[PDB]
């Protein structure tokens, strides 16, 4: 009841017009496995509109593609240039302005050897 309950709060955050029912009102037979029928009726629409939402717009396939390109490190044409520039700055102890020049080299090489799309790869922030 809570997993469909925490579910409904997210869909309200998307929009007020988008609700999950699919109107299954007056319910609750007195007898014994009344609960689980109303459990699956809410849970299978929880299967419905989230196959509709995130795969279409919020692009979990397109985020997880670029997620797998810079830690699992595919797209090795842009990548080998920036690891060479990161190696040149990390062969010594760092100063104050040195991490800012490291961040300038990140988006330089992105438009040098182009990625799938370049204003989507701006989700990479540099830490040590």
């Amino acid at each position: 009841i809570l997993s469909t309950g925490k579910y409904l709060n997210v869909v309200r955050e998307c929009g007020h017009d988008v609700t999950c029912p699919d109107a299954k009102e007056i319910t609750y037979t007195l007898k014994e496995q009344a609960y689980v029928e109303r459990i699956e009726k809410a849970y299978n629409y929880a299967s419905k509109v989230l196959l509709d939402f995130l795969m279409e717009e919020e692009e979990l396939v397109a985020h997880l593609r670029s997620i797998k390109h810079y830690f699992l490190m595919d797209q090795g044409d842009f990548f080998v240039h920036f690891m060479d520039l990161t190696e040149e700055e990390l062969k010594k102890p760092v100063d104050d302005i040195i991490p800012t020049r490291l961040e300038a080299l990140l988006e330089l090489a992105l438009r040098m050897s182009t990625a799938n799309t370049d204003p989507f790869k701006d989700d990479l922030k540099i830490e040590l």
Binding site: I97, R101, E103, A104, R111
Partner: protein, 39 residues
């Protein structure tokens, strides 16, 4: 010539802190400064 050496060290110190991106459209600002000095 000493003032041109002072000037070029300031603009190198400029572009370092401009690549030090805090990322609220700061990637946009670091994009524009290497485009000016090289092209």
């Amino acid at each position: 010539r000493i003032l041109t050496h002072f000037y070029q060290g300031i603009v190198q110190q400029f572009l370092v802190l401009l690549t030090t991106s805090t990322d609220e459209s700061l990637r946009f600002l670091s994009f524009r400064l290497d485009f000016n000095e090289h092209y």
